[PDB]
Design a protein around this ligand. Structure first.
Ligand SMILES: CC(=O)N[C@@H]1[C@@H](O)[C@H](O[C@@H]2O[C@H](CO)[C@@H](O[C@@H]3O[C@H](CO)[C@@H](O[C@@H]4O[C@H](CO)[C@@H](O)[C@H](O)[C@H]4NC(C)=O)[C@H](O)[C@H]3NC(C)=O)[C@H](O)[C@H]2NC(C)=O)[C@@H](CO)O[C@H]1O
Ligand SMILES: CC(=O)N[C@@H]1[C@@H](O)[C@H](O[C@@H]2O[C@H](CO)[C@@H](O)[C@H](O)[C@H]2NC(C)=O)[C@@H](CO)O[C@H]1O
Ligand SMILES: [Zn+2]
Ligand SMILES: [Zn+2]
Ligand SMILES: [Zn+2]
Ligand SMILES: [Zn+2]
Ligand SMILES: [Zn+2]
Length: 389
């Protein structure tokens, strides 16, 4: 890369209720769009989890009078984004939190690995994408951790062979979503990941929610020793462990939530609570663009480095990131020589000054400008093959 990553997860299910289409991305703020998620079978077969969202949906300019086999849905919409934003690379993300059960099996044999790599890369070269993100949540033991490395080396090796025939000189990106929890990351082959991958998207959030006994900061930088119940986890320990484990700092992209976690029937941060309540689309999770709510006031834990909102009238607290938090996390990641910012996820962001991804872009300054690929001469989609010309 020739500068900081400013990367955002784009969810293919975001096109429905959330009505967030690839054209809605503020592409000028983004170095990498990570397209989420592909599903996975136990025999390593990577599959579309939604073929309509992925390549069948016709947008206002998608004609049914097109000759040949053509890609539509988000695939064509993201290729349009790639054409208008040559510094924007699009990565295919496989698995995610709900679709990781088949990873151990998928990685367990040379045959399954070879099948995973081949089917993954097929979608990538057919859809006109710049690389593959593997979001296996998570390797549970030494066998799975070793096999994850064997899987990534199979994918790297097949990407390079694909490039050598159909995109000579182009470097396809290989990335992972990485856990911030020591229970999880202590099992990874960190030094192997640091060697084989372009980026580790550190998922430095989901520290506290319905799964927590007490209200907690969702994505704090540091431990609060004068209120440790408020910081069950901290990003700093995770980042240091990844670097000292042998992931080069510059390959670590700091993940940041574009949503908050709500706590109801609670006194405050570090305190006892009863239920997360309602959410934006799902119980106890609020889109950052729905935050802070009318009435609630944003307090800042300056030790933990984590903002939250509390309604003293309704006793609701919501851990979420503000623009100011983004500026602090960017100052932080630049201090440790990290590779940039990652966001989960695009649909929940505000527009203008108050955009978390926008704020990250200005804070980082010199974004990665490495050129994307528009040449897919082996795509089974004529429109992709012809670069939508
Ligand atoms: C990089 C990585 O590991 N990512 C972590 C994420 O896994 C995690 O984000 C959560 O991701 C899960 C999927 O893994 C996602 O689950 C989705 O839930 C939504 C419901 O909100 C479903 O959306 C519906 O889909 C149907 C059709 O499929 C639509 O018709 C309907 O309109 C949708 N409903 C709404 C309201 O939009 C998705 O189907 C489902 N996806 C899958 C594949 O199961 C969670 O929503 C994500 N959670 C959050 C908080 O965003 C993330 C944060 O915890 O951490 C990532 O880094
Ligand atoms: C820091 C840590 O390990 N916390 C765990 C949480 O990560 C985890 O929540 C889940 O974490 C994933 C991010 O790494 C998300 O993809 C996923 O959406 C999220 N699960 C939920 C509840 O949204 C919880 C599991 O309940 O465990 C913590 O220990
Ligand atoms: Zn709906
Ligand atoms: Zn059609
Ligand atoms: Zn290379
Ligand atoms: Zn590389
Ligand atoms: Zn810029």
């Amino acid at each position: 890369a020739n500068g900081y990553a400013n990367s955002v997860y784009f969810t293919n299910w975001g096109i429905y209720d959330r009505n967030f289409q690839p054209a809605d991305l503020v592409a000028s703020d983004v170095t990498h769009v990570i397209y989420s998620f592909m599903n996975l079978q136990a025999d390593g077969t990577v599959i579309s989890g939604d073929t309509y969202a992925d390549y069948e949906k016709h947008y206002a300019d998608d004609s049914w009078n097109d000759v040949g086999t053509n890609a539509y849905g988000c695939v064509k919409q993201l290729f349009k984004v790639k054409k208008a934003n040559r510094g924007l690379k699009v990565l295919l993300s496989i698995g995610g939190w709900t679709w990781s059960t088949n990873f151990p099996s998928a990685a367990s044999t040379d045959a399954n690995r070879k099948n995973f790599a081949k089917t993954a890369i097929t979608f990538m070269k057919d859809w006109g994408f710049d690389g593959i993100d593997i979001a296996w949540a998570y390797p549970a033991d030494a066998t799975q951790a070793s096999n994850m490395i064997l899987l990534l080396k199979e994918v790297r090796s097949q990407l390079d062979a694909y490039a050598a025939q159909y995109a000579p000189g182009y470097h396809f990106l290989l990335t992972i979503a990485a856990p911030a929890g020591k229970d999880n990351y202590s099992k990874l082959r960190l030094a192997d990941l640091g060697q084989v991958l372009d980026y580790i998207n550190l998922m430095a959030y989901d520290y506290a929610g319905s799964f927590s006994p007490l209200t907690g900061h969702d994505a704090n930088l540091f431990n609060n020793p004068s209120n440790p119940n408020a910081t069950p986890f901290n990003t700093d320990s995770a980042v240091k462990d990844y670097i000292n484990g042998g992931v080069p700092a510059n390959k670590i992209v700091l993940g940041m939530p574009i949503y908050g976690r709500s706590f109801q029937n609670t006194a405050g941060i570090g305190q006892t609570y009863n239920g997360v309540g309602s959410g934006s689309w799902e119980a106890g999770i609020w889109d950052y663009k729905a935050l802070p709510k009318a009435g609630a006031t944003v307090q800042y834990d300056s030790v933990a480095k984590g903002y939250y909102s509390y309604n003293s009238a309704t006793k609701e607290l919501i851990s979420f990131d503000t623009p100011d938090m983004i500026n602090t996390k960017v100052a932080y990641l630049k201090s440790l020589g990290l590779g940039g910012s990652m966001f989960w996820e695009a649909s929940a962001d505000k527009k203008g000054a108050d955009s978390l991804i926008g704020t990250s872009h200005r804070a980082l300054g010199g974004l990665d400008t490495t050129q994307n690929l528009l040449s897919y001469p082996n795509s089974k989609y004529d429109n992709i093959k012809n670069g939508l010309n």
